[PDB]
Design an enzyme around this catalytic site. Structure first.
Site, PDB file in Angstrom:
ATOM      1  N   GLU A 185     -41.710  17.483   9.622  1.00 62.31           N
ATOM      2  CA  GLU A 185     -42.996  17.025   9.083  1.00 62.31           C
ATOM      3  C   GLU A 185     -44.265  17.362   9.877  1.00 62.31           C
ATOM      4  O   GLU A 185     -45.053  16.472  10.179  1.00 62.31           O
ATOM      5  CB  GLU A 185     -42.932  15.524   8.794  1.00 62.31           C
ATOM      6  CG  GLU A 185     -41.936  15.220   7.677  1.00 62.31           C
ATOM      7  CD  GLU A 185     -41.818  13.747   7.362  1.00 62.31           C
ATOM      8  OE1 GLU A 185     -42.265  12.928   8.192  1.00 62.31           O
ATOM      9  OE2 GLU A 185     -41.270  13.406   6.283  1.00 62.31           O
ATOM     10  N   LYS A 295     -41.424  -4.175   6.268  1.00 57.99           N
ATOM     11  CA  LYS A 295     -42.331  -4.515   7.356  1.00 57.99           C
ATOM     12  C   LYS A 295     -42.531  -3.324   8.275  1.00 57.99           C
ATOM     13  O   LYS A 295     -41.559  -2.712   8.709  1.00 57.99           O
ATOM     14  CB  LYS A 295     -41.811  -5.710   8.162  1.00 57.99           C
ATOM     15  CG  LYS A 295     -42.821  -6.184   9.212  1.00 57.99           C
ATOM     16  CD  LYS A 295     -42.398  -7.478   9.892  1.00 57.99           C
ATOM     17  CE  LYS A 295     -41.443  -7.229  11.035  1.00 57.99           C
ATOM     18  NZ  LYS A 295     -41.227  -8.469  11.867  1.00 57.99           N
TER      19      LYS A 295
HETATM   20  O1  LIG Z   1     -50.457  14.694   2.019  1.00 56.62           O
HETATM   21  N1  LIG Z   1     -49.753  14.642   3.015  1.00 56.62           N
HETATM   22  O2  LIG Z   1     -49.606  15.628   3.719  1.00 56.62           O
HETATM   23  C1  LIG Z   1     -49.112  13.447   3.342  1.00 56.62           C
HETATM   24  C2  LIG Z   1     -48.164  13.404   4.355  1.00 56.62           C
HETATM   25  C3  LIG Z   1     -47.540  12.190   4.655  1.00 56.62           C
HETATM   26  C4  LIG Z   1     -47.881  11.052   3.933  1.00 56.62           C
HETATM   27  O3  LIG Z   1     -47.284   9.864   4.214  1.00 56.62           O
HETATM   28  C5  LIG Z   1     -46.741   9.632   5.494  1.00 56.62           C
HETATM   29  O4  LIG Z   1     -45.350   9.937   5.449  1.00 56.62           O
HETATM   30  C6  LIG Z   1     -44.758   9.731   6.734  1.00 56.62           C
HETATM   31  C7  LIG Z   1     -43.321  10.236   6.767  1.00 56.62           C
HETATM   32  O5  LIG Z   1     -42.666   9.934   5.538  1.00 56.62           O
HETATM   33  C8  LIG Z   1     -41.499   9.129   5.753  1.00 56.62           C
HETATM   34  O6  LIG Z   1     -41.905   7.944   6.434  1.00 56.62           O
HETATM   35  C9  LIG Z   1     -40.850   7.040   6.747  1.00 56.62           C
HETATM   36  C10 LIG Z   1     -41.489   5.777   7.324  1.00 56.62           C
HETATM   37  O7  LIG Z   1     -42.353   6.083   8.418  1.00 56.62           O
HETATM   38  C11 LIG Z   1     -39.922   7.776   7.722  1.00 56.62           C
HETATM   39  O8  LIG Z   1     -38.911   6.912   8.269  1.00 56.62           O
HETATM   40  C12 LIG Z   1     -39.315   8.935   6.947  1.00 56.62           C
HETATM   41  O9  LIG Z   1     -38.393   9.643   7.781  1.00 56.62           O
HETATM   42  C13 LIG Z   1     -40.457   9.869   6.592  1.00 56.62           C
HETATM   43  O10 LIG Z   1     -39.963  11.031   5.901  1.00 56.62           O
HETATM   44  C14 LIG Z   1     -44.816   8.243   7.062  1.00 56.62           C
HETATM   45  O11 LIG Z   1     -44.147   7.978   8.298  1.00 56.62           O
HETATM   46  C15 LIG Z   1     -46.272   7.832   7.133  1.00 56.62           C
HETATM   47  O12 LIG Z   1     -46.397   6.435   7.428  1.00 56.62           O
HETATM   48  C16 LIG Z   1     -46.930   8.153   5.804  1.00 56.62           C
HETATM   49  O13 LIG Z   1     -48.333   7.868   5.883  1.00 56.62           O
HETATM   50  C17 LIG Z   1     -48.830  11.097   2.922  1.00 56.62           C
HETATM   51  C18 LIG Z   1     -49.446  12.303   2.638  1.00 56.62           C
END
Ligand SMILES: O=[N+]([O-])c1ccc(O[C@@H]2O[C@H](CO[C@@H]3O[C@H](CO)[C@@H](O)[C@H](O)[C@H]3O)[C@@H](O)[C@H](O)[C@H]2O)cc1
Ligand SMILES: OC[C@H]1O[C@@H](O)[C@H](O)[C@@H](O)[C@@H]1O
Length: 393
Positions: A185, A295
């Site tokens: 990511e 949470k």
């Molecule tokens: O447009 N984008 O690029 C984009 C990227 C990411 C996104 O959301 C993020 O996505 C992240 C990662 O997504 C999941 O988030 C979960 C909770 O943190 C992880 O345990 C997973 O492994 C993971 O794949 C999150 O950690 C984070 O809190 C969240 O804001 C929203 C938009």
């Protein structure tokens, strides 16, 4: 592994080598002062820093030695899964000067590779956190920082990858490791994509230069479907490359606002879009979550958008009644089963799927174990109470 014919049916071993507060809140809750969360470390960097080296290692050794064991791999196999994705932080291999991180993960990674072998389970090793952070997510190790492409951080990341390549991309684990994922990511929208591409190319080339034929897994960096079609291609002699797509519908108000039918339509379209791509591809992270209610899912000291408690998001529904799966309405159980099945169909339409994650302490939307034991994740995973929601051709 036959990426052409075989379908990956897997789980992430998340929360093991990289702490995620929502997955193991018990490690973070002791820092709370009653209901005030302002003093809780927000990530593994700060958690290890606050604890100091001695305490951090004591607590992590207990965590590493109990969170995932051989029995988990047996149960994984018993449930019809054939694969695990294993996140690990750069700090397991290399510390920056002044890094608070403690090491020792490698011992358990190697036990894990042995347990995988013993249970006929294949593995991706996933470099989940890079120095400086590639995404500012707490699960990179370092929340709210985006410095992977600054200073020497990219080079340090490549050095850590070279270590991983030499240890795990060679003959010793050729029967177990079916991918090394260069970086989990990277947050494309805030990075220089040209430099990210060069980093991926450098990683790809470095791995092959060691004599390794291990598949190189590149995360999609949150780009549109098809973005990577012309990168690392056989036309350029670049082969055994798999794109890892992650998929959720919970990290914006707009996504959370969808009715269940629309959630299912989005999941189906993930399948249709993936099918059009040129590289082998696998959904390496996804879950059953239709809310961001768990949470600390969005981070320590952050609420849920679902109940209008984060990022100026408006209220949609209450989270409290969704925290405990024993308490779910029949509607939410049904919605969950439908959503999981739609995703399974979508992801098996190409390379398969890797659920996030095998287990959590008490976040049921994010636990393959809990969902399975509650009859919401199909068991066997081919079982369908809602067949053919997508109509794939
Ligand atoms: O447009 N984008 O690029 C984009 C990227 C990411 C996104 O959301 C993020 O996505 C992240 C990662 O997504 C999941 O988030 C979960 C909770 O943190 C992880 O345990 C997973 O492994 C993971 O794949 C999150 O950690 C984070 O809190 C969240 O804001 C929203 C938009
Ligand atoms: O295009 C699908 C797959 O074809 C294989 O021959 C290549 O080695 C892979 O890198 C590619 O992802």
């Amino acid at each position: 592994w036959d990426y052409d014919n075989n379908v990956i049916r897997g789980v992430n071993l998340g929360g093991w080598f990289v702490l995620e507060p929502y997955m193991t809140p018990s490690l973070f809750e002791p820092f709370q002062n009653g209901n005030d969360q302002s003093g809780v470390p927000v990530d593994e960097y700060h958690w290890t820093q606050t604890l100091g080296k001695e305490a951090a290692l004591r607590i992590l050794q207990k965590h590493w030695s109990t969170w995932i064991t051989e029995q988990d791999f047996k149960q994984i196999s018993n449930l019809g899964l054939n694969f695990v994705r294993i996140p690990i932080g750069y700090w397991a291999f290399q510390l920056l000067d002044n890094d608070p991180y403690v090491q020792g993960q490698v011992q358990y990674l190697e036990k894990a590779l042995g347990w995988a072998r013993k249970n006929n389970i294949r593995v991706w090793i996933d470099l989940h956190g890079a120095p400086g952070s590639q995404n500012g997510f707490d699960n990179s190790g370092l929340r709210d920082s985006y410095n992977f492409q600054n200073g020497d951080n990219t080079q340090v990341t490549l050095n850590v990858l070279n270590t991983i390549f030499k240890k795990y991309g060679g003959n010793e684990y050729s029967d177990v490791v079916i991918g090394i994922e260069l970086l989990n990511e990277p947050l494309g929208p805030v990075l220089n994509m040209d430099k990210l591409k060069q980093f991926f190319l450098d990683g790809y080339n470095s791995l092959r230069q060691t004599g390794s034929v291990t598949p190189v897994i590149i995360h999609d960096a949150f780009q549109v479907f098809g973005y990577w079609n012309n990168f690392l291609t056989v036309a350029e002699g670049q082969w055994n490359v798999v794109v890892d797509h992650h998929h959720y519908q919970v990290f914006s108000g707009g996504e959370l606002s969808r009715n269940i039918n629309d959630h299912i339509s989005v999941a189906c379209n993930w399948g249709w879009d993936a099918k059009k791509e040129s590289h082998w591809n696998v959904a390496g992270s996804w879950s059953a979550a239709l809310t961001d209610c768990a949470k600390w899912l969005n981070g320590v000291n952050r609420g849920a958008r679902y109940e209008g408690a984060y990022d100026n998001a408006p209220y949609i529904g209450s989270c409290q009644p969704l925290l405990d799966i024993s308490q779910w309405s029949d509607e939410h159980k049904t919605d969950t089963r439908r959503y999981i099945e739609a995703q399974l169909d979508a992801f098996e339409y190409t390379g398969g799927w890797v659920f996030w994650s095998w287990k959590t302490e008490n976040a049921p939307e994010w636990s393959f174990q809990t969902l399975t034991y509650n009859g919401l994740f199909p068991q066997p995973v081919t079982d369908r109470q809602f067949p053919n929601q997508c109509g794939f051709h």
